[PDB]
């Protein structure tokens, strides 16, 4: 598990993740179930299985370069410009060949959600739970041939922050018909470029694409989550992006402990989705 | 709310049902969310809304005749004999014109699930939680014209148990693609026939349909639920039916308290679905 990687189509064990035991809460009024457990709902079990399969398919040395993120926007199918409209009416994993999501949320909604999140961060009873990080970076993509290298530059001190090759490993599309946006959950790799020097080699040539990002990040260490709210100019097309990202460290430690003690892995996933849902719901209630 | 009934298309207030607060459990290792709440998942919120709308649309005097049940079987669409196959991959409310479910589960599965439930009822630590009721009844449907009256007769002492008019008010279809069966959630009315005598009037004439039911019921008062496992001969076509039914009393008391204290209504629903899910999952794991 820790020291191997197997392709998704060849994996045979799925770790058992047990349901939350009826917590030690004041004797409730109603048992949660006749077994006295709270079974995970179907979408959280799916995500738990998918995230485990996809990590277990990447080479152990590559695993600390994992980024697991949820991005908001609308799922569009291969044929039609409009949001997909399967015959379902509650949230679910959406599996249609060529369906895609481009992260982007209405500008007005983005500014009311930013105020909401800023307001939640300043309530005096939760102020030592969040930290706010504001940043402005220019990401430029260079082709080597053919590989695409992304170099990130901070606006103030034009020092190259990150120099990497980003590889898309997998994505789930969550169709959310009660909501004004759907969500894509992505597992990418951000692999640091090797021996190729950043500043020396590519200051000279022209990127094939440049994105400027103006971003406010809210880090909530107690739920292992970060919320990133960004205005991006895509060279120029503007998008407004809202992302939730899980802390990699904590993810890799939970995944390494899955045989030993499934419970850490299972409530990391549960919280990530619970944070996701709060944002999704707040964006839908602001849309009225 | 209590003393009115409004049609579904005309209802304007939806009660707010709050998320479970981070229970008083040993300080967990991970906050459940950045708000410190556990938002309800989308299918439980849907069911909570649907059940409230549908009760609120029935006339207050008719409400104690409500039966809220979950039945297992497969959703089939209008055109094709096979189980529906929308492009989704986790459980969701399934909304396709003319889609239908006929309650019926493989005979072999039904006998292994009966053993499982009997085994769960006899574990010494949960034996004062369940009671088992075995019964054999013949239900005969008579048309008056045109209304259909169902009279129920117990096999031993051929005394007519129930004499009623059953009215279907609504149904939700839950598409469960990870499972071997789907579920239909139904809200019916079982209205007791008025002044028409049972034994005198219809011993003479012939029913338009007769069903014999051999049933074992497991009553779990602490979760307000009953599990009913029945072999039915439909005059003769045999079906094997598995149903979960919520206790009406408790449902009507929770619904009456929804403005005052939403939490009873919300965890009655949550448990019903949690019980449903255990049965669904056990039926799917027995199917391998």
UniProtKB/Swiss-Prot annotation, chains A, B:
It is an enzyme of class 3 (hydrolase). It is found in: Nucleus. Signal peptide: none annotated. One of its GO terms (cellular component) is mRNA capping enzyme complex. Its main location: nucleus. The record marks 42 as: Essential for dimer formation. Its cofactor is Mg(2+). GO terms for biological process: 7-methylguanosine mRNA capping; positive regulation of protein localization to nucleus; positive regulation of transcription elongation by RNA polymerase II. It catalyses: a 5'-end triphospho-ribonucleoside in mRNA + H2O = a 5'-end diphospho-ribonucleoside in mRNA + phosphate + H(+). Optimum pH is 6.5-8.5. First step of mRNA capping. Converts the 5'-triphosphate end of a nascent mRNA chain into a diphosphate end. Heterodimer. The mRNA-capping enzyme is composed of two separate chains alpha and beta, respectively a mRNA guanylyltransferase and an mRNA 5'-triphosphate monophosphatase. Present with 3900 molecules/cell in log phase SD medium. This is mRNA-capping enzyme subunit beta. It comes from Saccharomyces cerevisiae (strain ATCC 204508 / S288c). The lineage of its organism: Eukaryota, Fungi, Dikarya, Ascomycota, Saccharomycotina. The gene is CET1.
